[PDB]
Enzyme design. Structure first.
Site, PDB file in Angstrom:
ATOM      1  N   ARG A 101      31.115  15.288 -10.264  1.00  0.00           N
ATOM      2  CA  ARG A 101      31.793  15.705  -9.045  1.00  0.00           C
ATOM      3  C   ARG A 101      31.055  15.134  -7.852  1.00  0.00           C
ATOM      4  O   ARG A 101      31.685  14.697  -6.905  1.00  0.00           O
ATOM      5  CB  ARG A 101      31.810  17.202  -9.011  1.00  0.00           C
ATOM      6  CG  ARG A 101      33.031  17.617  -8.257  1.00  0.00           C
ATOM      7  CD  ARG A 101      33.489  19.022  -8.569  1.00  0.00           C
ATOM      8  NE  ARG A 101      34.314  19.415  -7.447  1.00  0.00           N
ATOM      9  CZ  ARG A 101      34.555  20.688  -7.144  1.00  0.00           C
ATOM     10  NH1 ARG A 101      34.090  21.725  -7.846  1.00  0.00           N
ATOM     11  NH2 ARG A 101      35.146  20.938  -5.987  1.00  0.00           N
ATOM     12  N   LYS A 159      27.161  20.710 -20.067  1.00  0.00           N
ATOM     13  CA  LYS A 159      28.449  20.413 -19.519  1.00  0.00           C
ATOM     14  C   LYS A 159      28.396  20.766 -18.101  1.00  0.00           C
ATOM     15  O   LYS A 159      29.040  20.032 -17.353  1.00  0.00           O
ATOM     16  CB  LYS A 159      29.564  21.204 -20.170  1.00  0.00           C
ATOM     17  CG  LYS A 159      31.025  20.690 -20.076  1.00  0.00           C
ATOM     18  CD  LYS A 159      31.707  20.525 -21.482  1.00  0.00           C
ATOM     19  CE  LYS A 159      33.231  20.107 -21.531  1.00  0.00           C
ATOM     20  NZ  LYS A 159      33.661  19.309 -22.705  1.00  0.00           N
ATOM     21  N   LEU A 181      26.413  17.932 -16.158  1.00  0.00           N
ATOM     22  CA  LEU A 181      27.301  16.780 -16.027  1.00  0.00           C
ATOM     23  C   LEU A 181      28.563  17.009 -15.215  1.00  0.00           C
ATOM     24  O   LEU A 181      28.917  16.094 -14.473  1.00  0.00           O
ATOM     25  CB  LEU A 181      27.676  16.276 -17.407  1.00  0.00           C
ATOM     26  CG  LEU A 181      26.632  15.719 -18.383  1.00  0.00           C
ATOM     27  CD1 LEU A 181      27.337  15.515 -19.656  1.00  0.00           C
ATOM     28  CD2 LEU A 181      26.043  14.409 -17.972  1.00  0.00           C
ATOM     29  N   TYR A 182      29.267  18.154 -15.227  1.00  0.00           N
ATOM     30  CA  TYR A 182      30.398  18.409 -14.358  1.00  0.00           C
ATOM     31  C   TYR A 182      29.921  18.232 -12.920  1.00  0.00           C
ATOM     32  O   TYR A 182      30.618  17.684 -12.059  1.00  0.00           O
ATOM     33  CB  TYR A 182      30.854  19.814 -14.596  1.00  0.00           C
ATOM     34  CG  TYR A 182      31.859  20.315 -13.559  1.00  0.00           C
ATOM     35  CD1 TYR A 182      33.216  20.012 -13.675  1.00  0.00           C
ATOM     36  CD2 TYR A 182      31.402  20.992 -12.438  1.00  0.00           C
ATOM     37  CE1 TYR A 182      34.103  20.360 -12.669  1.00  0.00           C
ATOM     38  CE2 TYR A 182      32.277  21.341 -11.425  1.00  0.00           C
ATOM     39  CZ  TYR A 182      33.616  21.017 -11.549  1.00  0.00           C
ATOM     40  OH  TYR A 182      34.459  21.313 -10.500  1.00  0.00           O
ATOM     41  N   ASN A 183      28.703  18.674 -12.646  1.00  0.00           N
ATOM     42  CA  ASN A 183      28.101  18.615 -11.323  1.00  0.00           C
ATOM     43  C   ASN A 183      27.699  17.215 -10.862  1.00  0.00           C
ATOM     44  O   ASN A 183      27.996  16.806  -9.725  1.00  0.00           O
ATOM     45  CB  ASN A 183      26.884  19.565 -11.306  1.00  0.00           C
ATOM     46  CG  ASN A 183      27.277  21.025 -11.019  1.00  0.00           C
ATOM     47  OD1 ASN A 183      28.408  21.316 -10.656  1.00  0.00           O
ATOM     48  ND2 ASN A 183      26.411  22.032 -11.101  1.00  0.00           N
TER      49      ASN A 183
END
Lengths: 139, 132
Positions: A54, A46, A49-51
């Site tokens: 963004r 997670k 993927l959040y990175n």
């Protein structure tokens, strides 16, 4: 350069994409303005993927991104209270909506190239193009 | 219970065409992308599609981004989300995705708002999606 010589990890994805994408100058939007293609990015973890997400966002004004959600199991979904179709894994995904199909091919190939440069679990993020037969009407 | 009531509806509209639901490769190459409606009616259809079709896999509901702001200035941002939800149904064949897209359009068509407001498109993944 940030305080003490470094930048937030997604700021470095944004820039890495800007560079890969500077190499191919295909079209990004249409007159129609319809959302007909995308890239489905999944796996990693997670935080990888959040990175990525963004960063895609800061690098590409022309896309629209979903939140992160979890993925179902494939072949033999575990034991379950819930029916097998509905049982969800801890693998996340996110989708990028785009308006041309070649920008989606070039985006998917830049995510492939960038993440392979990074350490696990980030190198383990998978990506696939998709087209929507009638387009999606995003609000 | 709208779950089995919706499942019986799906079931009878699906029942008309007989197409392949499965391949020996087992690959997830098509889906039906379902959106609009409310969290609630969309959750209900999701549960019905699950009971009705054992051969498919479904995402949780999630939120959809904004599209294109008309005229000028304010253009939303890749990451802002709307209050509109969605889910995806993964399928092993493109033709059964054709048939379930049609079966969903016809079912919610005969229904009060907000169920009649659910839109539905077919989609394909070029390299497949390796579900876990």
């Amino acid at each position: 350069m940030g305080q003490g010589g470094s930048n937030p990890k997604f700021e470095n994805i944004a820039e890495g994409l800007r560079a890969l994408l500077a190499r191919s100058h295909v079209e990004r939007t249409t007159d129609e303005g319809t959302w007909v293609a995308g890239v489905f990015v999944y796996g990693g973890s997670k935080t990888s993927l959040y990175n990525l997400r963004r960063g895609t966002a800061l690098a590409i004004p022309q896309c629209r991104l979903t939140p992160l959600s979890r993925l179902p199991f494939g072949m033999a979904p575990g034991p379950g209270p819930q029916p097998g179709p509905l049982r969800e894994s801890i693998v996340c995904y996110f989708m990028v909506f785009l308006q041309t199909h070649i920008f989606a091919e070039v985006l998917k190939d830049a995510i492939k190239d960038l993440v392979m440069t990074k350490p696990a679990p980030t190198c383990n993020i998978r990506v696939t193009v998709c087209s929507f037969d009638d387009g999606v009407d995003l609000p």
